[PDB]
Design a binder for this molecule. Structure first.
Ligand code: SF4
Length: 1119
DNA sequence: CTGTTGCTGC
DNA sequence: TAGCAGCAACAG
C-alpha cells in the first residue's frame, strides 16, 4: 500500500512539474512516427526535431520511470522530450553451473516488484583469466520504476547478510550496479549529454556534430539587499527585502521596495568597463509583496533557462522563499523553484548557477579571495562598489541612490562572472559528463571522475565494482590502526634569502656532473629533436652548431667550476606529473594484482615481462597497544551494558555483541585511548614501511586508455586554441564582421582544454577518493613514490650544476649560473624552428633513461588476444622563466628553512608569484598582510645586496614605529582595521566543545553580547583583538570581538569589564585595551623570517636592529 | 617534544 | 565524498 501511495505522490509531483514546464514554454514534444531505415548520416531526412540538450531530470510518467530532456534547441525558444527506460541491476552467482536454480529462486522471491529478468555476460576485471575473453555470468533484474528496484534491494539485502555471517539462496554472491542514479543510467546507456546536440527520435537520441557551438540560453543573474539589525545578520522572519538587482542577457533591472527605500530611483548606467555594459531600468514597487510579485512575473515573462546568483543557495533564495511564505505566496507554483534534499534551490526548466560553487571548486582562488569583490578584482579586473553592511539599512533612508548603485554593482559582477567563466566551463563539462548543469556545478571533482570512468567501463562492457567501504578497524603488528596512508609528494626548503637576476651568487659546480652532461649531450639533443619535438635529426641543418655551442659553455663551467656571477632564476615543473606517471607505468586499480591473481593468470610463464613490480611507502598511525591488550579491552567491554540508539525499539539496553560492529569499535577505540595513555604514556606511533606491488601490463585497457585519450584530446584543443589564435589575428580588423562567433569558440576550446585538464588532474586524485569506486590506495602510493624519486633525481643534478632553492612535489625552483647553456633553436630544412631549453631537455633525457616503461603491453589483435610490448614514457619537465628575483624566508629555528612560501618577480618588475604567505590566506592578522604587501616589491631596490636589505629595513622601521607609538599616528577606524584578526570557524560553536582557540572565544563572546543568532550557522567570521594594558592573562582567553567597539557605551562597558576582569574600568579606548607587546612580537616574527634572518644567512649584518636575532644566531656569529 | 586546527600547496 | 606534506599558533 505504501509503495502505490509513494508512486501516486511522485506522479502528482510530475504533473505539477509538467504544468510549470509548459508555463515556461517546455511543452512535451512527441516526434512523428517514422517506419524508414534508421541511418544517422541522413539525419536531415530523419524525423522529429533536432535540439541541444540544456537540462535533464528524472521523472515518473503515466508510474513508469523516464527522463525529461529540455532543449534550448536550435532555432526554438525550447521544448522538452521524454525517454522511458527500465531501471535495472545485477545478481552475481558463486557457481556459474547453477545460475538457472538462482533464476527460478529470484523470479519467485521478487514476483511482487520484478518487471523482467535476463541472463547477461560482462567483463569482470577481478575474474581469473578475463583477459582471454572469459565473462562473468549475471542475472539482470529490470523494474517498471526506481521504487520497485529499491524494494527488490530491501528483499535481497537480508539474504546477503545471512550468507556472509552464517540451497539456491547460498548461490547469491552479491548484487552489482544497484546504486547508479537513474538519470545517470539513462544518460550513459543512451549516450545523451547536456552541452551536446541531439536529434530526438522514436528510437532514442542521436548525437549531432555539425554544431559544436552552444546555443545562447536566456541568462538571468540576480542579487538581493535586505534590512538588518545593527551588528547582527538579516533574519527572514523579521527583516524585509529592500531591493532586488538583476541582469537579463546584458540589460539591467532593479526592483525597489518603497516601504524601505525613501525616494523613487531613476534609470541609470553602471558600466565599470566598456566590456561590461549595465543599463538599469527601475521598478519602484509600493511594498515587499509587490516587489516579490514583480520579480516572479518578470521571471515568467523572460523564461530564463539559467538563473545565476552569488551564494544564493544559502542566502538569497532562502530569504525570498521565507518572505514569500510570510506573504502567502508559493514560490514553487509561481516560478518552479524549490529547496532540494540538500537545501539547495532548483527548478525543472531552469538551472541554478550559484557562481560561489564554481568559486569554491574550480576558480583556483584561495579561500581569502572567494568573496564577490575579491573574485571581481581577480577575474573581471575592476573594483566593484563596496558598502559597509551596517550602512545598508540606514542608506535605504539617507542615501538610497548610493545603495541602488551598490546593489546593481553586485548584479553586474555576478552576471559577467557567470558569462565569462562559469557558463563556458560548466556546459563544456556537461558535453562529456552524464550529469545536468546543477549537478556538474555542485558535485565534488572525484564524483566527476567516477561518472567518466562509469561511461568508459560501460562502453567496454565492463561490470562496475561496488563502492569501497573502509574497514571499521584494522591492525598492524597487533596494534589498532587509528589511520593508514602512504608517503605523499616530496617537499624541501633548501635555501632562504633574496635571489635577483641583477645580484651576484656564488656557484660551486661539480666537474663530474659536467663530465656526465658532456657524455649525455649527443643523445640528449637527439632526444629533444625525436621525442620532445617529434621530428627527425636528418631534417635539422644546425644540429652540430647547437651541440658545439653547448659543449663550449659546459667546458668553460668545468674548468672554472667555482664562479661568482649573476643567476638565472628558473622553475622546472613536470607537465601533469601524476597523470603522466600513471600513463607511463600503466597504473590503474584494474591491474594492481596479488601474487594469487598473477599465479592464476594463463599469461604467467617462465620469461614473463608483463608483471611490472613497483615500490610504494605505506604509513601507519597505530595505537601502541598489542593484539592481546586489544582482546583484553574487548573482553572487558563484553561485561558492560550500552544504551540503545534506536528510538523505535522498546529495548533500552544492549550487550556489547548486540551493538553494531562500528559501535563496538568506537567503544574499543575509546578504552584503548585511555589504556594506551596509562601504560605507554603516548598515543599514535607512526611507522613507514616500503612495500612492493605487481602492476599487470596485460590487464584490459580502459582506465589508462581513458587517460591517454583524454590527454591527447586536451593536447588537441591546446593545438586548436593556437590555430584559432592565429585566426584571430591573421584576418581584418572589422571586429563586427561575423567573426565574434570565432572568438566565442576560442573561449570554448580553451574551456574544453581546461575541462579535460581538471578531469585528468582529478583522475589523479579520485583514486584515493574514500568511499568512491575504482578506489586504489596502493596505486596512489606508487604514483607518489615514483614522483618523489623523479624530483629527487632532478634536484640531485640541479644541486651539482647550480643551487635549488625550493622543491614542491613536481616543481623545482633553482638558480643557475648566467653563463649556463639556456635556450636554442634547431632549424629544419623547411625553415621552421624547433625550440630547445637545455636545462629542461637534460632532465627529460635522464627521466627517459631511468623511468621509461619497457614492459608496456597493448592489445594489437582482440580476436586472438595478441599483445605487443613497447617502451612508454610521457614524463616531461616544462620550464618557466627566467626571472628578475626570488625571495625566500627563513625559519626562527637553527638550520631549518620554510617550505611553501616565496615571492618571485618578472623582468618587468611585476609580481609573478606569491605563495603561502599570510597576505594570501583567508583571515590572518591584517597588520601582517599589510606589512607583506608593502615589503616584497622593495626587494627590487638598491644596487647591492646590502642596499637592498637597507631599502626594506626602512619599510620595516615604518611599521615598527606604528606599534612602538601604540598606534597614535593612526585614525581610530584605521586602527581597528589594522589590528584585527579574522578567522573562519568551519563548524558551529557547539561542535567545538572542550577545545580552545581565539575563534571559539570570540564566537562565544559574540553570542553573549549580540545574541545566540550570531552563532547558529557554520562559517562564522570571528573578528577579534587581543587584550591587555599594563598586566597580562591567557591568550585564547583574551580575544575580544571588535564588534564590541561599535556597541552603545553602557553595553561596551559591561562587556569589556567582564572580559578583562576589571570591575572598575572607565577607559574604553581600544588603545588601552590592546596588548601592544603581543602585536610587536607577531610583527617581529615576520621581520625575522622575511628580512633579518635571511640577511644573516647571506652574510649581511642585521639590517633591522630594533628586531634582535635569536640567541642561536647571535651565537652562530663568533670567531 | 607532540597534537590539534585553518587555509594553503603546487 | 579525490590525495599527502607543511607553517605556525597555542596547549599540554
Ligand atoms: S603478470 Fe601476466 S600472468 Fe600475472 S596476472 Fe598479470 S597478465 Fe596475468
Amino acid at each position: 500500500s505504501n509503495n502505490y501511495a509513494l508512486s501516486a505522490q511522485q506522479l502528482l509531483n510530475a504533473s505539477k512539474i509538467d504544468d510549470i514546464d509548459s508555463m515556461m514554454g517546455f511543452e512535451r514534444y512527441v516526434p512523428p512516427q517514422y517506419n524508414g531505415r534508421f541511418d544517422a548520416k541522413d539525419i536531415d531526412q530523419i524525423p522529429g526535431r533536432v535540439g541541444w540538450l540544456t537540462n535533464m531530470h528524472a521523472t515518473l510518467v503515466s508510474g513508469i520511470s523516464g527522463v525529461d530532456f529540455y532543449f534550448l534547441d536550435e532555432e526554438g525558444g525550447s521544448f522538452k522530450s521524454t525517454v522511458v527506460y527500465d531501471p535495472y541491476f545485477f545478481i552475481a552467482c558463486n557457481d556459474e553451473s547453477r545460475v538457472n536454480d538462482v533464476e527460478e529462486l529470484v523470479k519467485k522471491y521478487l514476483e511482487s516488484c520484478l518487471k523482467s529478468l535476463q541472463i547477461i555476460r560482462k567483463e569482470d576485471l577481478t575474474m581469473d583469466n578475463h583477459l582471454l575473453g572469459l565473462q562473468k555470468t549475471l542475472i539482470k533484474l529490470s523494474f517498471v520504476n526506481s521504487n520497485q528496484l529499491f524494494e527488490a534491494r530491501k528483499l535481497l539485502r537480508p539474504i546477503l547478510q545471512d550468507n556472509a555471517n552464517n540451497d539456491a539462496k547460498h548461490l547469491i554472491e552479491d548484487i552489482r550496479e544497484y546504486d547508479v542514479p537513474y538519470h545517470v543510467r539513462v544518460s550513459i546507456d543512451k549516450d545523451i549529454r547536456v552541452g551536446k546536440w541531439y536529434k530526438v527520435t522514436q528510437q532514442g537520441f542521436i548525437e549531432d556534430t555539425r554544431k559544436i557551438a552552444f546555443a545562447d540560453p536566456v541568462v538571468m543573474a540576480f542579487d538581493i539587499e535586505t534590512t538588518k539589525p545593527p551588528l547582527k545578520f538579516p533574519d527572514s522572519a523579521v527583516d524585509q527585502i529592500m531591493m532586488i538587482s538583476y541582469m537579463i542577457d546584458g540589460e539591467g533591472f532593479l526592483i525597489t521596495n518603497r516601504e524601505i527605500i525613501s525616494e523613487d530611483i531613476e534609470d541609470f548606467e553602471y558600466t565599470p568597463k566598456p566590456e561590461y555594459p549595465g543599463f538599469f531600468t527601475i521598478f519602484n514597487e509600493n511594498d515587499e509583496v509587490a516587489l516579490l510579485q514583480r520579480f516572479f512575473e518578470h521571471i515568467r515573462d523572460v523564461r530564463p533557462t539559467v538563473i545565476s546568483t552569488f551564494n544564493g543557495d544559502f542566502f538569497d533564495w532562502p530569504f525570498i522563499h521565507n518572505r514569500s511564505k510570510i506573504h502567502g505566496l508559493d514560490m514553487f507554483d509561481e516560478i518552479g523553484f524549490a529547496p532540494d534534499a540538500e537545501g539547495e534551490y532548483k527548478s525543472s526548466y531552469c538551472s541554478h548557477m550559484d557562481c560561489f560553487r564554481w568559486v569554491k571548486r574550480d576558480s583556483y582562488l584561495p579561500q581569502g579571495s572567494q568573496g564577490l569583490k575579491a573574485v571581481t578584482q581577480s577575474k573581471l579586473g575592476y573594483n566593484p562598489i563596496e558598502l559597509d553592511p551596517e550602512l545598508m539599512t540606514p542608506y535605504a533612508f539617507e542615501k538610497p541612490q548610493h545603495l541602488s548603485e551598490y546593489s546593481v554593482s553586485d548584479a553586474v559582477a555576478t552576471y559577467y562572472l557567470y558569462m565569462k567563466y562559469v557558463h563556458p566551463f560548466i556546459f563544456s563539462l556537461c558535453t562529456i559528463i552524464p550529469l545536468n548543469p546543477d549537478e556538474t556545478l555542485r558535485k565534488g571533482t572525484g564524483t566527476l571522475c567516477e561518472m567518466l570512468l562509469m561511461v568508459q567501463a560501460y562502453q567496454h562492457n565492463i561490470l562496475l565494482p561496488n563502492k569501497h567501504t573502509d574497514p571499521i578497524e584494522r591492525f598492524y603488528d597487533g596494534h589498532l590502526l587509528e589511520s593508514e596512508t602512504y608517503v605523499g609528494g616530496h617537499v624541501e626548503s633548501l635555501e632562504a634569502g633574496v635571489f635577483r637576476s641583477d645580484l651576484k651568487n656564488e656557484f660551486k659546480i661539480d666537474p663530474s656532473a659536467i663530465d656526465e652532461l658532456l657524455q649525455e649531450l649527443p643523445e640528449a639533443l637527439k632526444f629533444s629533436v625525436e621525442v620532445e619535438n617529434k621530428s627527425s635529426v636528418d631534417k635539422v641543418t644546425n644540429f652540430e652548431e647547437i651541440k658545439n655551442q653547448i659543449t663550449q659553455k659546459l667546458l668553460e663551467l668545468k674548468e672554472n667550476n667555482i664562479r661568482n656571477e649573476l643567476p638565472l632564476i628558473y622553475h622546472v615543473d613536470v607537465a601533469s606529473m601524476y597523470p603522466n606517471i600513471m600513463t607511463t607505468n600503466r597504473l590503474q586499480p584494474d591491474s594492481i594484482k596479488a601474487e594469487r591473481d598473477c599465479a592464476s593468470c594463463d599469461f604467467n610463464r617462465p620469461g614473463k615481462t608483463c608483471a611490472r613490480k613497483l615500490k610504494w611507502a605505506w604509513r601507519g598511525e597505530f595505537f601502541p597497544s598489542k593484539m592481546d591488550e586489544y582482546n583484553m579491552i574487548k573482553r572487558a567491554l563484553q561485561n558492560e551494558t550500552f544504551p540503545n540508539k534506536n528510538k523505535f525499539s522498546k529495548k533500552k539496553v544492549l550487550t556489547f555483541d548486540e551493538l553494531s560492529y562500528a559501535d563496538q569499535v568506537i567503544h574499543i577505540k575509546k578504552r584503548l585511548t585511555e589504556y594506551s595513555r596509562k601504560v605507554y604514556h603516548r598515543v599514535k606511533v607512526s611507522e613507514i614501511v616500503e612495500r612492493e606491488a605487481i602492476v599487470c601490463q596485460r590487464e584490459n585497457p580502459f582506465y589508462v586508455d581513458t587517460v591517454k585519450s583524454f590527454r591527447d584530446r586536451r593536447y588537441e584543443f591546446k593545438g586548436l586554441a593556437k590555430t584559432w589564435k592565429g585566426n584571430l589575428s591573421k584576418i581584418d580588423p572589422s571586429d563586427k564582421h561575423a567573426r565574434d562567433e570565432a572568438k566565442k569558440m576560442i573561449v570554448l576550446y580553451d574551456s574544453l582544454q581546461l575541462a579535460h585538464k581538471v578531469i585528468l588532474n582529478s583522475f589523479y586524485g579520485y583514486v584515493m577518493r574514500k568511499g568512491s569506486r575504482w578506489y586504489s590506495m596502493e596505486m596512489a602510493g606508487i604514483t607518489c613514490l615514483t614522483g618523489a624519486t623523479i624530483i629527487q633525481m632532478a634536484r640531485a643534478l640541479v644541486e651539482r650544476v647550480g643551487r635549488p632553492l625550493e622543491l614542491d612535489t613536481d616543481g623545482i625552483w633553482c638558480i643557475l649560473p648566467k653563463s649556463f647553456p639556456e635556450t636554442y633553436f634547431f632549424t629544419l630544412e623547411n625553415g621552421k624552428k624547433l625550440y630547445l631549453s637545455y636545462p629542461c631537455s637534460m632532465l627529460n633525457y635522464r627521466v627517459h633513461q631511468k623511468f621509461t616503461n619497457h614492459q608496456y603491453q597493448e592489445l594489437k589483435d582482440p580476436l586472438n588476444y595478441i599483445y605487443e610490448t613497447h617502451s612508454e614514457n610521457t614524463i616531461f619537465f616544462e620550464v618557466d622563466g627566467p626571472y628578475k628575483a626570488m625571495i625566500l624566508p627563513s625559519s626562527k629555528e637553527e638550520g631549518k628553512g620554510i617550505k611553501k612560501r616565496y615571492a618571485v618577480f618578472n623582468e618587468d618588475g611585476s609580481l609573478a608569484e606569491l605563495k603561502g604567505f599570510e597576505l594570501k590566506r583567508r583571515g590572518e592578522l591584517q597588520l601582517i598582510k599589510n606589512f607583506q604587501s608593502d615589503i616584497f616589491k622593495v626587494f627590487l631596490e638598491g644596487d647591492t645586496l646590502e642596499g637592498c636589505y637597507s631599502a626594506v629595513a626602512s619599510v620595516c622601521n615604518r611599521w615598527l614605529d606604528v606599534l612602538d607609538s601604540h598606534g597614535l599616528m593612526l585614525e581610530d577606524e584605521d586602527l581597528v582595521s589594522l589590528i584585527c584578526e579574522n578567522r573562519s570557524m568551519s563548524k558551529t560553536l557547539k561542535e567545538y566543545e572542550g577545545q580552545k582557540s581565539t575563534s571559539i572565544t570570540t564566537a562565544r563572546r559574540l553570542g553573549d553580547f549580540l545574541g545566540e543568532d550570531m552563532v547558529k550557522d557554520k562559517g562564522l567570521q570571528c573578528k577579534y583583538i587581543i587584550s591587555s594594558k599594563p598586566f597580562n592573562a591567557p591568550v585564547t582567553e583574551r580575544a575580544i570581538p571588535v564588534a564590541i567597539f561599535s556597541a552603545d557605551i553602557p553595553i561596551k562597558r559591561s562587556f569589556l569589564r567582564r572580559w578583562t576582569l576589571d570591575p572598575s574600568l572607565e577607559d574604553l579606548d581600544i588603545r588601552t585595551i590592546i596588548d601592544w607587546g603581543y602585536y610587536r612580537e607577531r610583527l617581529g616574527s615576520a621581520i625575522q623570517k622575511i628580512i633579518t634572518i635571511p640577511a644573516a644567512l647571506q652574510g649581511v649584518s642585521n639590517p633591522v636592529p630594533r628586531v634582535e636575532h635569536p640567541d642561536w644566531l647571535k651565537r652562530k656569529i663568533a670567531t
